[PDB]
Design an enzyme around this catalytic site. Sequence first.
Site, PDB file in Angstrom:
ATOM      1  N   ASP A  35       0.896  -1.168  -0.074  1.00 15.88           N
ATOM      2  CA  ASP A  35      -0.042   0.131  -0.070  1.00 15.88           C
ATOM      3  C   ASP A  35       0.942   1.338   0.029  1.00 15.88           C
ATOM      4  OD1 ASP A  35      -1.946   1.992   0.229  1.00 15.88           O
ATOM      5  OD2 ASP A  35      -2.415   1.357   2.263  1.00 15.88           O
ATOM      6  N   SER A 199      -0.750  15.319 -11.869  1.00 15.33           N
ATOM      7  CA  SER A 199      -1.004  14.977 -13.177  1.00 15.33           C
ATOM      8  C   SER A 199      -1.206  16.309 -14.461  1.00 15.33           C
ATOM      9  CB  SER A 199      -2.173  14.292 -13.573  1.00 15.33           C
ATOM     10  OG  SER A 199      -2.445  13.875 -14.902  1.00 15.33           O
TER      11      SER A 199
END
Length: 330
Positions: A35, A199
């Site tokens: 994770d 992004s």
Amino acid sequence: STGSATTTPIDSLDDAYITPVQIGTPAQTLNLDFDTGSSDLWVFSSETTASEVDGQTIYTPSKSTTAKLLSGATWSISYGDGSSSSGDVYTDTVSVGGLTVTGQAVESAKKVSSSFTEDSTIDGLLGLAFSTLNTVSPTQQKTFFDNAKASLDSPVFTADLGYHAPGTYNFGFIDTTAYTGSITYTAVSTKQGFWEWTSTGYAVGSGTFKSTSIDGIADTGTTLLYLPATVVSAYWAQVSGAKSSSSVGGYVFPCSATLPSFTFGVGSARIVIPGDYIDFGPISTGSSSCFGGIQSSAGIGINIFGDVALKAAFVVFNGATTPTLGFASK
Ligand code: NA
């Protein structure tokens, strides 16, 4: 040193991935959920409340000659999905794919929430976010990556998740055979303890690319792609009959649909998520309403590039003094 381990989807939907981890001496192999959005290595154990264990493999520290109680240390964690676990702490030897750390904090669960109990395939979590998020008190502990780092050939790990197939976690090296083209690296902020990046925009299907900054985290422990509501609405508007369902808890779509792809930007580069990756199947067994793999991050307070996005790429988690992320197509 290096390590290399295969990661395997837990079910037909790729709801999560499990990776075998050796703990203790002799080894006890547990299947952990790696994770990159948390920083605790915790396991089902001989200490876990018996009624909260249903099929998981447990770590038994009393059977490990290298286990030592970390006296006075406790831990307690709550995840984004509402699940939680807590317990006490041992140090022990932990190996992943041939890479060994001695003295790793292994957080032994005394309590786990129902979603953990109900998932027999996950024996615990191995956190790969920054050690600043580790929950051990009163002495915070380091992640497996942070303890391995100095020994690694390169201070990196990579995630290569499969679509309906196994993939790979590598530590200490880039496998240049595992991706196409080049790796585009992008800046990381560690201020929230995550692999947080920006992004450069998105496209839906064959549509034009929208240049827009989307701050979010690379989180292998989250199944879906959670993005701003504007982006998500633009995606599902291209699917006839898709709608956001308050009763189901997100966007659903007709199981008869063919989904468009979703592209996200990494600098000037583009990662394309095929439409099929966005199908999470019937909302309930036999239903013709299917659950979407792109959902709104509104109310979560962060955008999450979970497995839907990451499994479309070869992803480099660069733990150099100044961390960075890298993405390649594959
Ligand atoms: Na669900």
